[PDB]
Amino acid sequence: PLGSMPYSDAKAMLDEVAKIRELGVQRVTRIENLENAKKLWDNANSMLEKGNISGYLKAANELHKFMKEKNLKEDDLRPELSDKTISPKGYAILQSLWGAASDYSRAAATLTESTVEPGLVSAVNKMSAFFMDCKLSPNERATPDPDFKVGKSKILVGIMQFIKDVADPTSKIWMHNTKALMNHKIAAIQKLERSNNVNDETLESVLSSKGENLSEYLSYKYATKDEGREHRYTASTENFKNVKEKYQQMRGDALKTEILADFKDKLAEATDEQSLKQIVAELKSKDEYRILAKGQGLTTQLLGLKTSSVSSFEKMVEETRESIKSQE
Protein backbone atom coordinates (compact mmCIF):
# COMPACT_ATOMS: atom_id res chain seq x y z
CA PRO A 1 0.00 0.00 0.00
CA LEU A 2 1.78 3.08 1.34
CA GLY A 3 3.95 0.52 3.11
CA SER A 4 7.03 1.93 4.87
CA MET A 5 5.88 5.55 5.09
CA PRO A 6 6.98 6.91 8.54
CA TYR A 7 4.57 7.78 11.34
CA SER A 8 4.98 11.56 10.88
CA ASP A 9 4.49 11.39 7.09
CA ALA A 10 1.32 9.35 7.64
CA LYS A 11 -0.06 12.15 9.84
CA ALA A 12 0.95 14.93 7.46
CA MET A 13 -0.49 13.24 4.37
CA LEU A 14 -3.55 12.51 6.52
CA ASP A 15 -4.03 16.23 7.21
CA GLU A 16 -3.31 17.45 3.68
CA VAL A 17 -5.98 14.97 2.58
CA ALA A 18 -8.43 16.38 5.13
CA LYS A 19 -8.15 19.77 3.39
CA ILE A 20 -9.10 18.38 -0.01
CA ARG A 21 -12.08 16.59 1.52
CA GLU A 22 -13.48 19.89 2.85
CA LEU A 23 -12.77 21.60 -0.48
CA GLY A 24 -14.70 18.74 -1.98
CA VAL A 25 -17.79 18.63 0.23
CA GLN A 26 -17.88 22.43 -0.18
CA ARG A 27 -17.79 22.32 -3.95
CA VAL A 28 -20.71 19.92 -3.59
CA THR A 29 -23.13 21.80 -1.33
CA ARG A 30 -22.28 24.89 -3.41
CA ILE A 31 -23.32 23.05 -6.54
CA GLU A 32 -26.14 21.59 -4.50
CA ASN A 33 -27.46 24.90 -3.12
CA LEU A 34 -27.12 26.82 -6.37
CA GLU A 35 -29.04 24.13 -8.21
CA ASN A 36 -31.71 24.50 -5.56
CA ALA A 37 -31.86 28.32 -5.63
CA LYS A 38 -32.08 28.01 -9.41
CA LYS A 39 -35.46 26.35 -8.85
CA LEU A 40 -36.72 28.92 -6.33
CA TRP A 41 -35.86 31.63 -8.85
CA ASP A 42 -37.93 29.88 -11.53
CA ASN A 43 -40.93 29.52 -9.23
CA ALA A 44 -40.87 33.26 -8.88
CA ASN A 45 -40.38 33.86 -12.61
CA SER A 46 -43.38 31.56 -13.14
CA MET A 47 -45.71 33.67 -10.94
CA LEU A 48 -44.33 36.82 -12.56
CA GLU A 49 -45.04 35.43 -16.00
CA LYS A 50 -48.68 34.66 -15.34
CA GLY A 51 -49.32 38.07 -13.76
CA ASN A 52 -49.83 36.94 -10.12
CA ILE A 53 -48.43 40.00 -8.33
CA SER A 54 -49.16 38.98 -4.70
CA GLY A 55 -47.53 35.68 -5.67
CA TYR A 56 -44.37 36.51 -7.61
CA LEU A 57 -43.93 38.83 -4.67
CA LYS A 58 -44.04 35.99 -2.15
CA ALA A 59 -42.03 33.67 -4.44
CA ALA A 60 -39.25 36.21 -4.84
CA ASN A 61 -39.10 36.39 -1.05
CA GLU A 62 -38.55 32.62 -0.75
CA LEU A 63 -35.61 32.97 -3.12
CA HIS A 64 -34.19 35.93 -1.24
CA LYS A 65 -34.56 34.24 2.16
CA PHE A 66 -32.79 31.11 0.94
CA MET A 67 -30.03 33.06 -0.81
CA LYS A 68 -29.37 35.14 2.27
CA GLU A 69 -29.44 32.07 4.50
CA LYS A 70 -26.74 30.40 2.36
CA ASN A 71 -24.42 33.40 1.82
CA LEU A 72 -25.15 33.57 -1.92
CA LYS A 73 -25.13 36.74 -4.06
CA GLU A 74 -26.89 37.47 -7.36
CA ASP A 75 -23.48 37.09 -8.96
CA ASP A 76 -23.35 33.54 -7.62
CA LEU A 77 -26.65 32.41 -9.15
CA ARG A 78 -26.56 34.46 -12.39
CA PRO A 79 -24.18 32.10 -14.26
CA GLU A 80 -26.62 29.26 -13.53
CA LEU A 81 -29.53 31.18 -15.04
CA SER A 82 -28.00 31.80 -18.50
CA ASP A 83 -30.52 29.15 -19.58
CA LYS A 84 -33.69 31.05 -18.60
CA THR A 85 -35.30 34.36 -19.58
CA ILE A 86 -37.63 37.08 -18.26
CA SER A 87 -40.36 37.96 -20.78
CA PRO A 88 -40.51 41.59 -21.90
CA LYS A 89 -43.94 41.10 -20.33
CA GLY A 90 -42.23 40.22 -17.05
CA TYR A 91 -39.90 43.22 -17.11
CA ALA A 92 -42.99 45.25 -17.98
CA ILE A 93 -44.55 44.25 -14.64
CA LEU A 94 -41.20 44.42 -12.83
CA GLN A 95 -40.84 48.10 -13.76
CA SER A 96 -44.45 48.95 -12.86
CA LEU A 97 -43.90 47.37 -9.46
CA TRP A 98 -40.69 49.35 -8.91
CA GLY A 99 -42.66 52.51 -9.70
CA ALA A 100 -45.61 51.71 -7.47
CA ALA A 101 -43.35 50.53 -4.68
CA SER A 102 -41.10 53.59 -5.10
CA ASP A 103 -44.03 56.05 -4.86
CA TYR A 104 -46.09 54.28 -2.18
CA SER A 105 -42.76 54.40 -0.35
CA ARG A 106 -42.48 58.19 -0.50
CA ALA A 107 -46.17 58.74 0.29
CA ALA A 108 -46.22 56.36 3.23
CA ALA A 109 -43.79 58.71 5.01
CA THR A 110 -46.29 60.95 6.84
CA LEU A 111 -45.70 63.33 9.73
CA THR A 112 -47.67 60.89 11.89
CA GLU A 113 -45.41 57.92 11.34
CA SER A 114 -42.72 57.66 8.67
CA THR A 115 -40.49 54.76 9.63
CA VAL A 116 -42.10 51.28 9.56
CA GLU A 117 -44.49 51.57 6.65
CA PRO A 118 -42.07 53.30 4.26
CA GLY A 119 -39.40 50.95 5.54
CA LEU A 120 -41.45 47.92 4.66
CA VAL A 121 -42.60 49.05 1.23
CA SER A 122 -38.89 49.44 0.52
CA ALA A 123 -38.09 46.07 2.03
CA VAL A 124 -40.21 44.73 -0.84
CA ASN A 125 -38.98 46.99 -3.62
CA LYS A 126 -35.39 46.19 -2.63
CA MET A 127 -35.88 42.40 -2.60
CA SER A 128 -37.97 42.50 -5.77
CA ALA A 129 -34.94 43.93 -7.55
CA PHE A 130 -32.97 41.11 -6.00
CA PHE A 131 -34.83 38.50 -8.07
CA MET A 132 -34.21 40.59 -11.16
CA ASP A 133 -30.48 41.13 -10.53
CA CYS A 134 -30.01 37.38 -10.28
CA LYS A 135 -30.62 37.44 -14.03
CA LEU A 136 -30.00 40.83 -15.63
CA SER A 137 -26.22 41.29 -15.98
CA PRO A 138 -25.03 44.53 -14.27
CA ASN A 139 -23.96 46.14 -17.54
CA GLU A 140 -27.23 45.43 -19.37
CA ARG A 141 -30.43 47.43 -19.01
CA ALA A 142 -34.03 46.24 -18.65
CA THR A 143 -36.02 45.81 -21.87
CA PRO A 144 -39.73 46.37 -21.04
CA ASP A 145 -42.77 46.18 -23.31
CA PRO A 146 -43.82 49.84 -23.86
CA ASP A 147 -47.09 48.32 -25.11
CA PHE A 148 -48.02 46.19 -22.07
CA LYS A 149 -49.01 48.01 -18.88
CA VAL A 150 -50.60 46.90 -15.62
CA GLY A 151 -52.90 48.89 -13.38
CA LYS A 152 -51.10 50.79 -10.65
CA SER A 153 -54.07 49.90 -8.46
CA LYS A 154 -53.78 46.14 -9.06
CA ILE A 155 -50.10 46.29 -8.24
CA LEU A 156 -50.52 48.35 -5.06
CA VAL A 157 -53.13 45.92 -3.69
CA GLY A 158 -50.59 43.21 -4.38
CA ILE A 159 -47.84 44.90 -2.44
CA MET A 160 -50.11 45.46 0.57
CA GLN A 161 -51.42 41.96 0.17
CA PHE A 162 -47.83 40.71 0.54
CA ILE A 163 -46.77 42.99 3.41
CA LYS A 164 -49.85 41.79 5.25
CA ASP A 165 -49.07 38.08 4.81
CA VAL A 166 -45.47 38.46 6.04
CA ALA A 167 -45.74 41.03 8.79
CA ASP A 168 -46.05 39.77 12.38
CA PRO A 169 -49.44 39.80 14.23
CA THR A 170 -47.70 42.30 16.55
CA SER A 171 -46.19 44.47 13.82
CA LYS A 172 -47.57 47.95 14.24
CA ILE A 173 -47.68 51.05 12.06
CA TRP A 174 -48.24 54.14 14.23
CA MET A 175 -50.96 53.05 16.67
CA HIS A 176 -52.45 50.26 14.59
CA ASN A 177 -51.73 46.57 13.95
CA THR A 178 -49.99 46.55 10.52
CA LYS A 179 -52.12 43.58 9.49
CA ALA A 180 -55.29 45.53 10.26
CA LEU A 181 -54.08 48.74 8.58
CA MET A 182 -52.85 47.01 5.41
CA ASN A 183 -56.17 45.22 5.20
CA HIS A 184 -57.90 48.58 5.63
CA LYS A 185 -55.94 50.21 2.82
CA ILE A 186 -56.55 47.26 0.55
CA ALA A 187 -60.28 47.68 0.97
CA ALA A 188 -59.96 51.46 0.50
CA ILE A 189 -58.12 51.06 -2.81
CA GLN A 190 -60.47 48.37 -4.04
CA LYS A 191 -63.47 50.63 -3.33
CA LEU A 192 -61.90 53.12 -5.73
CA GLU A 193 -61.45 50.44 -8.39
CA ARG A 194 -65.16 49.60 -8.13
CA SER A 195 -66.11 53.24 -8.64
CA ASN A 196 -63.59 53.76 -11.46
CA ASN A 197 -62.25 56.61 -9.33
CA VAL A 198 -58.55 55.76 -9.20
CA ASN A 199 -56.16 58.62 -9.95
CA ASP A 200 -52.88 60.06 -8.64
CA GLU A 201 -54.92 62.24 -6.29
CA THR A 202 -57.26 59.72 -4.61
CA LEU A 203 -54.44 57.17 -4.38
CA GLU A 204 -51.66 59.31 -2.90
CA SER A 205 -54.39 59.88 -0.31
CA VAL A 206 -54.99 56.29 0.75
CA LEU A 207 -51.29 55.46 0.57
CA SER A 208 -50.47 58.53 2.63
CA SER A 209 -52.89 57.49 5.41
CA LYS A 210 -52.48 55.90 8.86
CA GLY A 211 -56.17 55.81 9.71
CA GLU A 212 -55.88 58.63 12.24
CA ASN A 213 -59.62 59.14 12.13
CA LEU A 214 -61.21 56.48 14.37
CA SER A 215 -64.58 57.96 13.36
CA GLU A 216 -63.92 56.53 9.89
CA TYR A 217 -61.20 53.95 10.54
CA LEU A 218 -63.63 51.54 12.22
CA SER A 219 -66.86 52.71 10.52
CA TYR A 220 -68.31 53.18 13.99
CA LYS A 221 -69.71 56.68 13.70
CA TYR A 222 -69.39 57.31 17.48
CA ALA A 223 -65.87 55.89 17.92
CA THR A 224 -63.97 57.60 20.69
CA LYS A 225 -61.75 57.25 23.74
CA ASP A 226 -63.50 59.36 26.37
CA GLU A 227 -67.03 60.21 27.56
CA GLY A 228 -68.95 60.18 24.30
CA ARG A 229 -72.72 59.90 24.21
CA GLU A 230 -75.23 59.53 27.03
CA HIS A 231 -77.47 56.58 27.88
CA ARG A 232 -79.98 54.90 30.18
CA TYR A 233 -78.19 51.62 29.65
CA THR A 234 -74.50 52.51 29.23
CA ALA A 235 -72.33 49.62 28.11
CA SER A 236 -70.68 48.35 31.31
CA THR A 237 -68.07 45.62 31.74
CA GLU A 238 -69.58 43.43 34.48
CA ASN A 239 -72.72 41.27 34.24
CA PHE A 240 -70.39 39.03 32.23
CA LYS A 241 -67.52 37.01 33.69
CA ASN A 242 -65.51 36.32 30.51
CA VAL A 243 -64.29 39.83 29.68
CA LYS A 244 -60.47 39.95 29.66
CA GLU A 245 -58.73 42.64 31.76
CA LYS A 246 -58.38 45.91 29.76
CA TYR A 247 -62.16 46.43 29.37
CA GLN A 248 -62.85 47.66 32.92
CA GLN A 249 -62.65 51.37 33.63
CA MET A 250 -63.90 51.28 30.03
CA ARG A 251 -67.27 53.02 30.11
CA GLY A 252 -69.94 52.53 27.48
CA ASP A 253 -69.32 54.35 24.20
CA ALA A 254 -65.51 54.39 24.48
CA LEU A 255 -65.67 50.73 25.46
CA LYS A 256 -67.43 49.73 22.30
CA THR A 257 -64.72 51.58 20.38
CA GLU A 258 -62.06 49.57 22.23
CA ILE A 259 -63.69 46.19 21.70
CA LEU A 260 -64.52 47.11 18.13
CA ALA A 261 -60.88 47.92 17.45
CA ASP A 262 -59.54 44.69 18.99
CA PHE A 263 -61.98 42.75 16.86
CA LYS A 264 -60.79 44.57 13.73
CA ASP A 265 -57.32 43.33 14.58
CA LYS A 266 -58.10 39.73 15.53
CA LEU A 267 -60.25 39.66 12.39
CA ALA A 268 -57.33 40.65 10.17
CA GLU A 269 -55.58 37.33 10.87
CA ALA A 270 -57.89 35.44 8.48
CA THR A 271 -56.22 33.83 5.47
CA ASP A 272 -59.21 32.10 3.88
CA GLU A 273 -62.90 31.19 3.91
CA GLN A 274 -62.67 28.63 6.72
CA SER A 275 -60.05 30.60 8.66
CA LEU A 276 -62.38 33.62 8.69
CA LYS A 277 -65.56 31.67 9.35
CA GLN A 278 -63.89 30.49 12.55
CA ILE A 279 -62.41 33.78 13.75
CA VAL A 280 -65.89 35.24 13.36
CA ALA A 281 -67.58 32.27 15.07
CA GLU A 282 -65.03 32.38 17.89
CA LEU A 283 -65.77 36.12 18.13
CA LYS A 284 -69.57 35.97 18.18
CA SER A 285 -69.17 33.39 20.96
CA LYS A 286 -67.30 35.86 23.19
CA ASP A 287 -69.02 37.95 25.85
CA GLU A 288 -67.62 41.28 24.68
CA TYR A 289 -69.55 40.63 21.47
CA ARG A 290 -72.77 40.67 23.43
CA ILE A 291 -71.60 43.93 24.98
CA LEU A 292 -71.73 45.33 21.46
CA ALA A 293 -75.07 43.76 20.60
CA LYS A 294 -76.64 45.18 23.78
CA GLY A 295 -78.37 48.53 23.26
CA GLN A 296 -77.61 51.77 25.13
CA GLY A 297 -80.87 53.69 24.93
CA LEU A 298 -84.48 52.79 25.68
CA THR A 299 -85.75 53.06 22.11
CA THR A 300 -82.95 51.02 20.50
CA GLN A 301 -83.56 48.21 23.02
CA LEU A 302 -87.36 48.11 23.48
CA LEU A 303 -87.25 47.35 19.74
CA GLY A 304 -84.17 45.15 19.59
CA LEU A 305 -82.49 47.11 16.81
CA LYS A 306 -79.13 45.95 15.53
CA THR A 307 -76.88 48.40 17.36
CA SER A 308 -74.28 50.55 15.56
CA SER A 309 -71.33 48.58 16.99
CA VAL A 310 -72.65 45.35 15.57
CA SER A 311 -73.73 47.17 12.42
CA SER A 312 -70.11 48.16 11.99
CA PHE A 313 -68.59 44.82 13.13
CA GLU A 314 -70.61 43.20 10.34
CA LYS A 315 -69.15 45.56 7.77
CA MET A 316 -65.60 44.85 9.00
CA VAL A 317 -66.32 41.21 8.37
CA GLU A 318 -67.61 41.92 4.89
CA GLU A 319 -64.59 43.96 3.78
CA THR A 320 -62.47 41.08 5.04
CA ARG A 321 -64.36 38.41 3.11
CA GLU A 322 -63.82 40.67 0.08
CA SER A 323 -60.13 41.27 0.84
CA ILE A 324 -59.93 37.46 0.75
CA LYS A 325 -62.18 36.57 -2.19
CA SER A 326 -59.77 38.44 -4.49
CA GLN A 327 -56.64 36.74 -3.24
CA GLU A 328 -58.38 34.15 -5.46
XYZ file of C-alpha atoms in Angstrom:
328
model
C 0.000 0.000 0.000
C 1.783 3.083 1.338
C 3.950 0.521 3.108
C 7.034 1.928 4.871
C 5.878 5.551 5.094
C 6.983 6.912 8.542
C 4.574 7.783 11.343
C 4.979 11.555 10.881
C 4.493 11.394 7.095
C 1.320 9.353 7.640
C -0.058 12.147 9.836
C 0.955 14.932 7.462
C -0.489 13.239 4.374
C -3.554 12.507 6.519
C -4.034 16.226 7.205
C -3.308 17.448 3.681
C -5.982 14.975 2.580
C -8.434 16.377 5.132
C -8.152 19.772 3.389
C -9.097 18.377 -0.011
C -12.080 16.588 1.518
C -13.482 19.892 2.846
C -12.771 21.595 -0.482
C -14.705 18.744 -1.977
C -17.786 18.634 0.233
C -17.882 22.429 -0.175
C -17.789 22.324 -3.954
C -20.705 19.917 -3.591
C -23.127 21.799 -1.332
C -22.285 24.888 -3.408
C -23.323 23.049 -6.545
C -26.144 21.591 -4.499
C -27.456 24.900 -3.119
C -27.118 26.816 -6.370
C -29.041 24.130 -8.214
C -31.708 24.499 -5.558
C -31.861 28.319 -5.627
C -32.081 28.011 -9.409
C -35.458 26.351 -8.847
C -36.723 28.922 -6.333
C -35.857 31.634 -8.854
C -37.927 29.875 -11.528
C -40.934 29.524 -9.230
C -40.873 33.264 -8.879
C -40.375 33.864 -12.610
C -43.375 31.562 -13.138
C -45.714 33.672 -10.938
C -44.327 36.822 -12.560
C -45.042 35.432 -16.005
C -48.685 34.656 -15.339
C -49.322 38.067 -13.762
C -49.825 36.936 -10.123
C -48.435 40.004 -8.326
C -49.155 38.975 -4.698
C -47.531 35.681 -5.667
C -44.373 36.507 -7.614
C -43.934 38.829 -4.669
C -44.041 35.985 -2.146
C -42.029 33.673 -4.439
C -39.252 36.205 -4.840
C -39.104 36.388 -1.050
C -38.554 32.624 -0.749
C -35.612 32.974 -3.121
C -34.195 35.928 -1.236
C -34.556 34.241 2.162
C -32.793 31.111 0.944
C -30.032 33.057 -0.811
C -29.367 35.135 2.267
C -29.438 32.072 4.500
C -26.735 30.400 2.365
C -24.418 33.396 1.821
C -25.147 33.574 -1.917
C -25.133 36.740 -4.058
C -26.886 37.474 -7.362
C -23.481 37.087 -8.958
C -23.348 33.541 -7.623
C -26.649 32.414 -9.148
C -26.558 34.457 -12.395
C -24.185 32.105 -14.259
C -26.616 29.261 -13.534
C -29.534 31.182 -15.042
C -28.003 31.795 -18.501
C -30.520 29.155 -19.577
C -33.694 31.046 -18.597
C -35.302 34.363 -19.578
C -37.632 37.076 -18.258
C -40.359 37.961 -20.779
C -40.505 41.592 -21.900
C -43.937 41.103 -20.329
C -42.234 40.218 -17.046
C -39.898 43.218 -17.115
C -42.991 45.253 -17.979
C -44.547 44.245 -14.641
C -41.200 44.421 -12.833
C -40.837 48.104 -13.756
C -44.453 48.947 -12.860
C -43.895 47.374 -9.459
C -40.691 49.353 -8.906
C -42.662 52.509 -9.701
C -45.609 51.713 -7.473
C -43.346 50.533 -4.675
C -41.104 53.591 -5.098
C -44.030 56.052 -4.857
C -46.091 54.283 -2.181
C -42.764 54.397 -0.347
C -42.484 58.188 -0.504
C -46.170 58.738 0.286
C -46.220 56.364 3.233
C -43.790 58.711 5.010
C -46.292 60.955 6.842
C -45.701 63.330 9.735
C -47.672 60.885 11.886
C -45.409 57.919 11.341
C -42.722 57.660 8.667
C -40.493 54.761 9.633
C -42.101 51.278 9.564
C -44.489 51.572 6.649
C -42.075 53.303 4.260
C -39.400 50.954 5.541
C -41.455 47.918 4.656
C -42.600 49.052 1.227
C -38.895 49.440 0.518
C -38.094 46.066 2.033
C -40.212 44.726 -0.839
C -38.983 46.988 -3.625
C -35.395 46.192 -2.627
C -35.881 42.403 -2.601
C -37.972 42.501 -5.769
C -34.943 43.925 -7.550
C -32.966 41.109 -5.998
C -34.829 38.499 -8.074
C -34.211 40.589 -11.157
C -30.476 41.134 -10.531
C -30.015 37.383 -10.281
C -30.617 37.437 -14.034
C -30.003 40.833 -15.633
C -26.223 41.287 -15.977
C -25.032 44.533 -14.275
C -23.961 46.139 -17.538
C -27.234 45.431 -19.366
C -30.433 47.426 -19.013
C -34.027 46.240 -18.647
C -36.023 45.811 -21.875
C -39.731 46.370 -21.039
C -42.774 46.183 -23.314
C -43.816 49.838 -23.860
C -47.090 48.324 -25.107
C -48.022 46.191 -22.072
C -49.013 48.013 -18.885
C -50.597 46.905 -15.624
C -52.904 48.888 -13.379
C -51.100 50.786 -10.653
C -54.073 49.899 -8.458
C -53.780 46.138 -9.055
C -50.097 46.288 -8.237
C -50.522 48.347 -5.056
C -53.125 45.921 -3.694
C -50.587 43.207 -4.378
C -47.835 44.897 -2.442
C -50.110 45.465 0.571
C -51.418 41.960 0.168
C -47.834 40.710 0.540
C -46.774 42.991 3.406
C -49.845 41.788 5.245
C -49.071 38.084 4.810
C -45.467 38.456 6.043
C -45.736 41.030 8.787
C -46.052 39.770 12.384
C -49.443 39.800 14.235
C -47.700 42.301 16.550
C -46.194 44.471 13.820
C -47.573 47.951 14.242
C -47.683 51.046 12.063
C -48.240 54.144 14.227
C -50.962 53.050 16.669
C -52.452 50.257 14.585
C -51.729 46.572 13.954
C -49.991 46.550 10.517
C -52.122 43.580 9.494
C -55.286 45.534 10.255
C -54.083 48.745 8.583
C -52.847 47.006 5.410
C -56.174 45.223 5.196
C -57.902 48.584 5.634
C -55.943 50.206 2.824
C -56.548 47.258 0.552
C -60.278 47.675 0.970
C -59.959 51.456 0.503
C -58.117 51.060 -2.808
C -60.469 48.369 -4.038
C -63.466 50.633 -3.331
C -61.900 53.118 -5.725
C -61.449 50.439 -8.395
C -65.156 49.601 -8.131
C -66.113 53.239 -8.642
C -63.588 53.757 -11.457
C -62.249 56.615 -9.329
C -58.546 55.758 -9.198
C -56.159 58.624 -9.951
C -52.883 60.056 -8.640
C -54.917 62.237 -6.287
C -57.261 59.721 -4.606
C -54.436 57.167 -4.381
C -51.658 59.306 -2.897
C -54.386 59.881 -0.306
C -54.993 56.285 0.753
C -51.292 55.461 0.573
C -50.470 58.528 2.635
C -52.891 57.491 5.406
C -52.475 55.902 8.858
C -56.166 55.814 9.711
C -55.876 58.630 12.244
C -59.616 59.141 12.133
C -61.206 56.484 14.373
C -64.579 57.962 13.358
C -63.917 56.534 9.891
C -61.201 53.947 10.538
C -63.633 51.541 12.222
C -66.862 52.710 10.520
C -68.312 53.180 13.993
C -69.708 56.685 13.705
C -69.387 57.307 17.481
C -65.872 55.892 17.920
C -63.967 57.600 20.691
C -61.747 57.245 23.736
C -63.498 59.362 26.373
C -67.027 60.209 27.561
C -68.949 60.183 24.296
C -72.722 59.899 24.208
C -75.234 59.530 27.032
C -77.474 56.576 27.879
C -79.981 54.900 30.178
C -78.192 51.619 29.650
C -74.505 52.511 29.230
C -72.330 49.621 28.107
C -70.684 48.352 31.310
C -68.070 45.625 31.743
C -69.577 43.432 34.485
C -72.720 41.271 34.236
C -70.391 39.030 32.232
C -67.519 37.015 33.686
C -65.511 36.322 30.506
C -64.286 39.829 29.678
C -60.471 39.947 29.658
C -58.731 42.643 31.757
C -58.384 45.906 29.760
C -62.159 46.433 29.371
C -62.854 47.656 32.924
C -62.649 51.374 33.632
C -63.900 51.278 30.026
C -67.266 53.024 30.114
C -69.944 52.526 27.480
C -69.323 54.349 24.199
C -65.515 54.393 24.481
C -65.666 50.732 25.463
C -67.431 49.733 22.302
C -64.720 51.579 20.375
C -62.060 49.566 22.235
C -63.686 46.188 21.696
C -64.524 47.107 18.126
C -60.877 47.920 17.452
C -59.536 44.694 18.993
C -61.982 42.755 16.863
C -60.794 44.571 13.732
C -57.317 43.334 14.582
C -58.100 39.728 15.526
C -60.253 39.662 12.386
C -57.334 40.652 10.169
C -55.584 37.332 10.868
C -57.887 35.444 8.479
C -56.217 33.827 5.468
C -59.210 32.100 3.877
C -62.899 31.190 3.914
C -62.673 28.632 6.722
C -60.045 30.596 8.664
C -62.379 33.622 8.689
C -65.560 31.667 9.351
C -63.886 30.494 12.546
C -62.412 33.784 13.748
C -65.886 35.243 13.361
C -67.582 32.267 15.069
C -65.031 32.378 17.888
C -65.767 36.115 18.126
C -69.574 35.966 18.177
C -69.168 33.389 20.963
C -67.301 35.858 23.190
C -69.016 37.946 25.855
C -67.621 41.280 24.681
C -69.555 40.628 21.472
C -72.774 40.674 23.433
C -71.600 43.925 24.977
C -71.727 45.326 21.457
C -75.066 43.758 20.597
C -76.645 45.178 23.779
C -78.367 48.529 23.262
C -77.608 51.773 25.134
C -80.874 53.690 24.928
C -84.480 52.788 25.682
C -85.745 53.063 22.106
C -82.947 51.017 20.503
C -83.560 48.215 23.021
C -87.361 48.110 23.476
C -87.248 47.350 19.739
C -84.165 45.150 19.590
C -82.486 47.112 16.808
C -79.128 45.945 15.527
C -76.885 48.396 17.359
C -74.277 50.553 15.565
C -71.331 48.579 16.990
C -72.653 45.346 15.573
C -73.732 47.169 12.420
C -70.108 48.162 11.994
C -68.592 44.818 13.131
C -70.608 43.201 10.341
C -69.146 45.561 7.770
C -65.596 44.852 9.004
C -66.316 41.207 8.368
C -67.612 41.924 4.888
C -64.589 43.964 3.780
C -62.467 41.076 5.042
C -64.361 38.412 3.108
C -63.822 40.670 0.082
C -60.131 41.269 0.838
C -59.926 37.461 0.751
C -62.182 36.573 -2.191
C -59.769 38.439 -4.485
C -56.638 36.735 -3.241
C -58.380 34.150 -5.463
